[PDB]
Amino acid sequence: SHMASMKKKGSVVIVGRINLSGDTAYAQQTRGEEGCQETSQTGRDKNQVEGEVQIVSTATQTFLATSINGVLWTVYHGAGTRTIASPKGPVTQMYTNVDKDLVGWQAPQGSRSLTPCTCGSSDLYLVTRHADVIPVRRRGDSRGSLLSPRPISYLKGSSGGPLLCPAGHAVGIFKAAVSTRGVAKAVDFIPVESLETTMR
Ligand SMILES: C=C[C@@H]1C[C@]1(NC(=O)[C@@H]1C[C@@H](Oc2ncc(OC)c3ccc(Cl)cc23)CN1C(=O)[C@@H](NC(=O)OC(C)(C)C)C(C)(C)C)C(=O)NS(=O)(=O)C1CC1
Numbered sequence: 334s335h336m337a338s339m340k341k342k343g344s345v346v347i348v349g350r351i352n353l354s355g356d357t358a359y360a361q362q363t364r365g366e367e368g369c370q371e372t373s374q375t376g377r378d379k380n381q382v383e384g385e386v387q388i389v390s391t392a393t394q395t396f397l398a399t400s401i402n403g404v405l406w407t408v409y410h411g412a413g414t415r416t417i418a419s420p421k422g423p424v425t426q427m428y429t430n431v432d433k434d435l436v437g438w439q440a441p442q443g444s445r446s447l448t449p450c451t452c453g454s455s456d457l458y459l460v461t462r463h464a465d466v467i468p469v470r471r472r473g474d475s476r477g478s479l480l481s482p483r484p485i486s487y488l489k490g491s492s493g494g495p496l497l498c499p500a501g502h503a504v505g506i507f508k509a510a511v512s513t514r515g516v517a518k519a520v521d522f523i524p525v526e527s528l529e530t531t532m533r
């Protein structure tokens with residue numbers, strides 16, 4: 334083929350956040366589609382970053398990313414091997430594991446990090462891209478049941494979002510829905526211990 338006209342994939346772009354700083358959880362958009370597209374190609378993102386849970390986008394997908402221990406984590410099936418846009422240009426992943434469906438970049442300046450859970454608690458809460466907080470009972474190392482099942486439509490675009498313990502520690506990163514006839518009864522996640530193993 335003709336290398337001179339081979340395209341490059343864009344960067345992952347932060348387009349908003351799930352605000353969890355107050356009494357009420359709600360989604361905020363910080364960048365529109367025109368801006369997202371331009372920032373994805375340049376990889377230069379001068380927007381102020383805040384909070385632990387970012388809403389991110391490529392040209393073709395939108396999902397979430399969560400800061401834990403100074404690393405912005407998300408799913409490989411969303412991000413691939415892409416760089417993330419940042420103030421001084423594209424930033425290369427510092428973690429990539431296709432087997433775990435996991436990628437990570439250094440956490441953006443301005444972001445806040447969740448602390449990894451050491452509670453050993455099995456009463457969890459999944460935070461969606463729509464800022465719904467979904468009670469989840471932990472059922473194994475990497476699976477939890479929804480207390481109230483939801484159609485998979487409800488969860489689509491929330492991979493890379495956090496499962497939190499009652500104290501607000503990060504317990505895992507949302508990976509896949511366990512679905513029966515389109516209804517999500519459970520969720521698979523990357524447990525925080527796996528992140529911490531990946532970090533070492
Ligand atoms: C509905 C919301 C769920 C959380 C969600 N994730 C998904 O859709 C994922 C992607 C795909 O699975 C996997 N791909 C690649 C992997 O590695 C590279 C995986 C390594 C390990 C495992 Cl576990 C799965 C992997 C299929 N899938 C399912 O969840 C599927 N379920 C699934 O596969 O369930 C079982 C695993 C139990 C079979 C299905 C779509 C059918 C519900 C999402 O929101 N995505 S997204 O929209 O944001 C998209 C990033 C833009």
Ligand SMILES: [Zn+2]
Nearest residue numbers: 450452498502
């Ligand atoms: Zn905890």
